[PDB]
Amino acid sequence: TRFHSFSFYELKNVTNNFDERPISVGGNKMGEGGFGVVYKGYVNNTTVAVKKLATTEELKQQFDQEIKVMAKCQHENLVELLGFSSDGDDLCLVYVYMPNGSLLDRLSCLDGTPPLSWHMRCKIAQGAANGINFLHENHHIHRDIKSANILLDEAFTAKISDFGLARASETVMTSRIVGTTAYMAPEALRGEITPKSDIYSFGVVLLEIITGLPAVDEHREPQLLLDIKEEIEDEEKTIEDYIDKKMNDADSTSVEAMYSVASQCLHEKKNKRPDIKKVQQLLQEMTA
Ligand SMILES: Cn1cc(NC(=O)c2cnn3ccc(N4CCNCC4)nc23)c(C(N)=O)n1
């Protein structure tokens, strides 16, 4: 699969010269981080997301890795790359716009958006697991599974994004440790590169979905969301004490069933964790 070659100046024009202001005030910046900034634009009679990236040589390796992975990977639970740009000063990746933004923003109700229902959340959890399943089936390790890298389309379908740090398989080691600390598996923090780390990170995402709490909060106890698994196991608290209060359709059974999947995902011994196909099965059984 191949993609259109966009002109830098077409992208610069449709994104109002890559404006840093939010959409409400009258700007174009949508999200920042992800080794680049995502801006809003309207090209070829449609709304698009333009990622401007942004060591300069390692940044283009992340640009080339994302196109390589997208040429090879087309799925309904992955973001859709429409084209790219190299001719300008900066590097750009053009995607199909995901109107509902990131799961992180939707879980925090950024800008006053209504809280996601449990029904919506089960659908997102299932969809996200289908996207990771597709990557693992095609021998790709994401390396940065987190709620800020799961996007939501017009119908709240989960779309996995950011494949710049992706790795093939088709256990490796590296001196360049990359990812988001609060989501990373112990071995991933040590340099190991394995698809088992993606499962651990997906367990943190399932806890964010259940609780609505961010993976890391400086002004909180525990500051790291993954530590609640121990509070529940060493029966001081229970999962009901952590369920997101911003839901009226969350029954205890299905929540506990999602938590069970998260608990299994968050096993510290990488070999004890389930593979993605099992995570996928258990999430399907939860609804059904
Ligand atoms: C409403 N709306 C649409 C958005 N962003 C998008 O529609 C979007 C489309 N493809 N894609 C690929 C990656 C990406 N980001 C990677 C880094 N983490 C943030 C997401 N965002 C997008 C956003 C956003 N916050 O990026 N908000």
Closest atom of ligand 1 to 34 CA is 17
Same domain, 91 and 13: yes
Distance from C-alpha of 19 to C-alpha of 52, rounded to nearest angstrom: 11
151 Cα: distance to centroid of ligand 1 (angstroms): 6
Whether residues 232 and 119 share a domain: the answer is: yes
Same structural domain, 217 and 167? yes
Residues 184, 260 share a domain: yes
Please report the atom of ligand 1 found closest to the CA of residue 95. Answer: 10
Domain count, the chain: 2
Distance CA 172, CA 147 (A): 25
The one catalytic residue in 64, 90, 105, 144 is: 144
Phi, psi of 286 (to 5 degrees): -60, -45
Tokens for 59, please give them: 């940044």
Distance, CA of 10 to CA of 4 (rounded, Å): 13
> How many helices and strands, by DSSP H and E, does the chain display?
9, 12
Indicate whether 216 and 125 sit together in one domain: yes
Beta bridge partners of residue 96, listed in sequence order: 48
As annotated, the binding site for ATP includes 30-38, 51, 146-149, 162
81, 97, 113 — which closes off a domain? 97
Out of 97, 132, 147, a domain closes at: 97
Closest listed residue to residue 20, CA positions, set 31, 11, 7: 31
106 and 234 both lie in a single domain: yes
Tell me whether residue 275 is one of the annotated catalytic residues: no
Contact of 166 with 64, CB cutoff 8 Å = no
Ligand 1 centroid to residue 222 C-alpha, Å: 29
- Residues 278, 268: Cα–Cα separation, whole Å: 17
- The technique is X-ray
Determine the Cα–Cα distance for residues 22 and 279; give it in Å rounded to an integer: 36
Query: In this structure, what DSSP letter does residue 241 have?
Result: G
Q: Is 49 close to ligand 1, i.e. is its CB under 6 Å away?
A: yes
One domain for residues 79 and 125: no
- The number of beta carbons lying within 10 Å of the beta carbon of residue 13 is 12
> What is the Cα–Cα distance from 132 to 161, expressed in whole angstroms?
10
Determine the distance separating the centroid of ligand 1 and the alpha carbon of 101, expressed in angstroms: 6
Give the position of tokens 């996007």.
151
- Taking the C-alpha atoms of residue 78 and residue 72, their distance in angstroms, rounded to an integer, is 12
Return d(Cα 126, Cα 280) in angstroms, integer. 7
Q: Which of 50, 63, 73, 102 to mutate to test the pocket of ligand 1 (most atoms within 8 A of CB)?
A: 102
Report the sign of the C-alpha dihedral through residues 145, 149, 152, 153, in that order.
negative
**Nearest alpha carbon to residue 239 among 210, 204, 200, 198:** 210
- Spatial contact of 181 and 144, defined as CB atoms under 8 Å apart: no
150 and 59, same domain (yes or no): no
Answer with the one of 39, 71, 97 that is the final residue of a domain: 97
- Residue 48 domain boundaries: 1-97
Q: Are strands 46-52 and 81-85 parallel, antiparallel or unpaired?
A: unpaired
Here the CATH number for the domain that contains residue 58 is 3.30.200.20
Backbone dihedral angles phi then psi of residue 21, each to the nearest 5 degrees: -75, 160
* Cα-to-centroid distance, 233 and ligand 1 (Å): 35
- 98: Cβ below 6 Å to ligand 1? yes
Q: Is 97 in the pocket of ligand 1 (CB under 6 A)?
A: yes
Q: Which residue minimizes the CA distance to atom 20 of ligand 1?
A: 149
* CA nearest to 21, candidates 35, 34, 37, 44: 37
Residues 88 and 104 in one domain: no
Q: Are residues 118 and 252 in the same domain?
A: yes
Q: Is residue 147 within 8 Å of 103, Cβ to Cβ?
A: yes
The DSSP secondary structure of 57-116, one letter per residue, reads HHHHHHHHHHHHHHHH---TTB--EEEEE-SSSS-EEEEE--TT-BHHHHHHTGGGPPPP
Nearest atom within ligand 1 for CA of residue 105: 25
Residue 151: enclosing H or E segment and its boundaries?
strand 150-152
